[PDB]
Symmetry: C3
Subunit: 335 residues, 3 copies
């Protein structure tokens, strides 16, 4: 029984940050209470001013990451302001039953509902808006994020030994299908429903116009780059609700990677590139051993550097000449 | 030595059912005998009447699923009626040598042949047509299915614990490449050969016009939906001979999943979505805990809901409030 | 300390061969010294005379495979001759730091540089010309290969049992984006620079015009086929620097398969089809049990048989009827 466990409330933070949380916890099963508000909005998605008629949780792509522990219960209040055009609902991949919650959360504009489900399974899980068997749209327009259900005992390697991250980051990869006019420039829509027919048509082509990390081309670069330092251990949570992707850290690795994102299975080690299946979320742990500016990307490099699926990590610390050294700098070829 | 062993005869059932079989067995190596007849035919593949000049094993997509046990010998008589136009053959991914049988099963129309092979490795394996010259086409037009080679002792988890399913279902997902007219509507061909040139042209674009489970859009929906009940454990065999896919069960999971579909390896638990590599078949077990109508799909949702890679499972039983509760129904937002 | 270790020189060999090397070794850590010279050249990539303005390490696609042992140091001198027209660098997926060595190997035509890194992790790793955050033109144009870091002890099955191969072969799968004219025929470019704008544009569509193994359609067939014999065990190293592939050996398997290509991880057995992620290199082991002609291919059959992703292995030895026998040859259907 669940109506009698201690109810707690979590303040959510917008990506790429994850709300503060305990890994291995002394604590016992709780009900964790969260609130998310759907926000439909036109967002600028690239540097030449192209816009998406987007649909977000809490006004960001991805929605924020929800952290709990195995055996906890998740209790969500989903809010659909009257200023929105469309109905919404939520399918938690971590939940069990009634289409992951979607049947119990159909909120029209100006409505709200509260769902609870047991987080009986550990790993990173996608949550995303739902279609009644209908051409996605809501999903690809931005309605997804991650639920992370940590093992009560912390993260464990294949031999059972414990693993701890100093900090977790969350990346949502969105394949966008922005329509083009006869002039060959991208279309700009006044309202959401205006964008529908043209978008559906682009979707059939299975060819994203852009693929972005966290809402925008270059969203995780420059002033907004991720940060860590040598010796630090990061957990990179990668969600892709609709399409396969292949994450990679440049001059880095995946020390321990759950590419299927299910913590009960033994992680894999030493990975150069791993694979997030469309409609799943995986996680990777890396301990930085060198300073400098790393890139973190989808290693279809067209998708990365031509379509937008890439970001940076700025790393403080001491250069290690053992791991890598420049024996001879670029110089003219011997006469 | 092979001829010595008992020769038994299986009569196959059409998908989505799997022919009655024993999981864990006390029997010893038998030579299991099957017959499949190649049916060339035009089939209606969607709700708006679009046709496919199809090629099939036993007049269905996929072919029926052949079940044996590790160490059994598979003996297939392959019939190519005089009424067909094209030659055929078969490649079992489960067999060893001569292109998986293909070089020894080259039947012209009005010919038949009999191939035996040792089923020495266990798992779900794709079988597909594989002539000289024109392999993809025969394959994409519908000529694949699954051979399930069960390990002699039944299915085992990573610890060695025994695993048992109550009913098994076979889903073959087919990426279809139907040509279009200059007026934008799908072409309708009088004969199979007339479809060739136009189809190949669509094929080079690597973009399916449709992607269907078992021969058509909504083949596993409504009256034809898969059926189960709370406490039942199902094996969902998923084959895709030509193209990657990523199966998911909405508000379900894979309790145990061999995504590469080879049973000697340890399965994975708690998967939200798994990945069937093009030209492979995989398997997942799930034990239902909630009633209702589940959706089984390719979790590229464009491919699912727009191109047709989706089906339903209708689940009988009693709602478990512990797993999920609608705390508060969709009401107006408080002031 | 590295400078005080023995320095050895390796002569590199052209694919599909891998330079002579020891699997399990009693030798201590060494600094293994390599030289690669970048060559930009126009190449014929299909049977119908289509050309690619290519870029290569050592005048081949892929670049030669570099073999070392866990604990060794790789020391590459990258030579960019004054005969080339573009700058180049190198990113080793098996290196830690500075975009995998890219930031310290930027050589303008007529320059060269020398890089050292510690091969601290075991597996097959891609190396490729680094695109410092730009459209991956050099990559898709041919600039990648594998670095194999063998564990010092040899390869190990999931139980710790030792595995050994008689020969290793390296296949680099390249997805090409050759432009077309208004007339519908593939373009031919006078210089490499002239090919840029048009190519980038094809790339944006994510649809390769061709997908070739080792630098052209049928490059590993006929006189150039891979060769083995019954009882021989081969390592098949498959790299794809930019796009997903799914290798399969026809009427063959992957006895042990590191599809993520990292040897410190348990391999999987009995695979019909494996999955190399774009931006990674995987390895498979197979012991031939039947003679004849085999096809090694991408099991997206459109990509294999129409776009060019397939090769052949010729296998010597004696047919084994227990594994597979032709019971009745193709002959008229009886009454
Ligand atoms: O390792 N990305 O070039
Ligand atoms: O909405 N697919 O879980
Ligand atoms: O097994 N490829 O036809
Ligand atoms: Cu929505
Ligand atoms: Cu979903
Ligand atoms: Cu056929
Ligand atoms: Cu095949
Ligand atoms: Cu280069
Ligand atoms: Cu790379």
């Amino acid at each position: 029984d669940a109506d009698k466990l201690p109810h707690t409330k979590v303040t959510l933070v917008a990506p790429p940050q994850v709300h503060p949380h305990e890994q291995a916890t002394k604590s016992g099963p709780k009900v964790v209470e969260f609130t998310m508000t759907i926000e439909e909005k036109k967002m600028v998605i690239d540097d030449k001013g192209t816009t998406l008629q987007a649909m977000t949780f809490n006004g960001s792509m991805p929605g924020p990451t929800l952290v709990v522990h195995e055996g906890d219960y998740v209790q969500l209040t989903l809010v659909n302001p009257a200023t929105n055009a469309m109905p919404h609902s939520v399918d938690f991949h971590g939940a069990t039953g009634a289409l992951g919650g979607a049947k119990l959360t159909n909120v029209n504009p100006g409505e709200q509902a509260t769902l609870r489900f047991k987080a009986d399974r550990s790993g990173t899980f996608v949550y995303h808006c739902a279609p009644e068997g209908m051409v996605p749209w809501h999903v690809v327009s931005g309605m997804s994020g991650t639920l992370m259900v940590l093992p009560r005992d912390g993260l464990k390697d294949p031999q059972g030994k414990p693993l701890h991250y100093d900090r977790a980051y969350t990346i949502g990869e969105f394949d966008l299908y922005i329509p083009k006019g006869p002039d060959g420039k991208y279309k700009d829509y006044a309202t959401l429903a205006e964008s529908y027919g043209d978008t559906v048509q682009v979707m059939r082509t299975l060819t994203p116009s852009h693929i972005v990390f966290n809402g925008k081309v270059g969203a995780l670069t420059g002033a907004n780059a991720l940060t860590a330092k040598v010796g630090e251990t990061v957990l990179l949570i990668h969600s892709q609700a609709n399409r396969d992707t292949r994450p990679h850290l440049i001059g880095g690795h995946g020390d321990w990677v759950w590419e299927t994102g299910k913590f009960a299975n033994p992680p894999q080690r030493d990975l150069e590139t791993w694979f997030i299946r469309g409609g799943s979320a995986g996680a990777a742990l890396y301990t930085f051993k060198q300073p400098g500016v790393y890139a973190y990307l989808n290693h279809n490099l067209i998708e990365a550097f031509e379509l937008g699926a890439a970001g940076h990590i700025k790393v403080e610390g001491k250069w290690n000449d053992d791991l890598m050294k420049q024996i001879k700098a670029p110089a003219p070829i011997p006469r």
